[PDB]
Design a protein around this ligand. Structure first.
Ligand SMILES: CC1(C)S[C@H]([C@@H](C=O)NC(=O)[C@H](N)c2ccc(O)cc2)N[C@H]1C(=O)O
Length: 343
């Protein structure tokens, strides 16, 4: 007997424990977390025990900025040190007003720092350097709007409306993960690209089988794709290491002692039972150790009639999971510094 599934039992336990505790700590309704082994697509942990991580869809928020960032970089429209002006609000060519989470002093900042702070006013300028059809194409390549094809029941495909349907609001909201709906597994599969030299590897819960007596491992199916170039992947991976740097959205709370973390936070309004934007999903997508990623993690906590933030709600779950996984996988602490671009 060989265990044919990919789940790590102890990691799964840590995942469920942390997630349950955080959903309660924060007064959420539910949560989800997915842990992928980098390079293999092997699913190390999936919480909760339902098919929630596979069937629940929500607007992911600013974790979706990674797609926008990767599109602009891959199309060679901006570099990590390209500067844009950030301000409390910004009025766009099309008449839309974009605002940052909280008012702050107007300043110039690099692309790297814009992502670290997650300034929407800076992000929309990064996104405007590329057309809607191109961004939409990168969204599909990243796996949005499609089932990941994992062999579990009830997987949802999510909602990615054709860009031909995007109005003036959508043009911008889709840049920061609003006006699209994803699953937690889609989030993990997506962030893993940046630790896989731009390659998306479809997630798997079933290893092979021995096939010594009876060939039971699937013929063919699978297939990974190059979403983004190797250089684009490395660059986003470098930029993501700004998350736990001072001023980064994940500072302190997303840090895993002794390991370099690459991360993005998100906080997105979601539609409540009432039919209005009463709810929020707090998201966190991460890669660790950043210098040479071994796992990709996505966490969502959902709260009805309230605000939860990716950093304060979801990052602590990532931390508990990542801390165990590094021991469990016997990964030594980071010997190189956390990457920093000028901001
Ligand atoms: C709260 C933020 C710093 S703003 C920005 C964006 C994407 O998630 N979120 C929003 O613009 C969202 N509409 C929102 C929700 C509640 C807020 O207080 C502010 C912004 N990234 C966030 C993050 O990193 O968690």
């Amino acid at each position: 007997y060989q265990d044919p599934l990919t789940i790590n039992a102890d990691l799964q336990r840590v995942a469920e424990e942390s997630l349950n505790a955080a959903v309660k700590r924060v007064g959420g309704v539910w949560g989800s977390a997915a842990v992928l082994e980098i390079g293999t697509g092997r699913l190390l942990a999936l919480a909760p025990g339902g098919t929630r991580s596979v069937s629940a869809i929500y607007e992911p928020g600013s974790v979706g900025k990674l797609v926008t960032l990767a599109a602009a970089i891959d199309q060679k429209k901006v570099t990590p040190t390209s500067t844009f002006t950030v301000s409390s609000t910004r009025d766009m060519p099309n008449g839309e007003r974009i605002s940052d989470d909280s008012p702050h002093e107007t300043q110039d900042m690099t692309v790297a720092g814009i992502i670290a702070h997650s300034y929407n006013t800076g992000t929309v300028q990064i996104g405007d350097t590329v057309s809607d059809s191109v961004r939409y194409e990168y969204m599909q390549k990243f796996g949005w709007g499609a089932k990941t094809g994992i062999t579990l029941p009830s997987e949802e495909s999510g909602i990615l409306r054709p860009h031909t349907e995007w109005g003036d609001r959508d043009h911008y909201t889709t840049m920061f993960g609003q006006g699209v709906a994803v699953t937690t597994i889609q989030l993990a599969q997506m962030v893993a690209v940046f630790g896989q030299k731009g390659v998306l590897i479809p997630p798997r819960i079933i290893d092979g089988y021995d096939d010594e007596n009876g060939v039971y491992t699937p013929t063919v199916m699978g297939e990974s794709r190059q979403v983004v170039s190797e250089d684009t992947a490395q660059t986003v991976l470098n930029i993501m290491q700004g998350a736990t740097q001072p001023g980064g959205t994940a500072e302190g709370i997303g840090a895993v002692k002794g390991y370099n973390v690459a991360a993005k936070t998100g906080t997105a309004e979601n539609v409540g039972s009432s039919g209005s934007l009463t709810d929020t999903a707090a998201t966190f997508t991460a890669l660790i150790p950043a210098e040479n990623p071994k796992i990709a993690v996505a966490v969502v906590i959902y709260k009805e009639n309230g605000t939860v933030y990716g950093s304060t709600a979801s990052a602590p779950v990532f931390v508990d999971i990542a801390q165990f996984a590094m021991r469990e996988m016997k990964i030594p602490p980071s010997t190189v510094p956390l990457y920093k671009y000028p901001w």
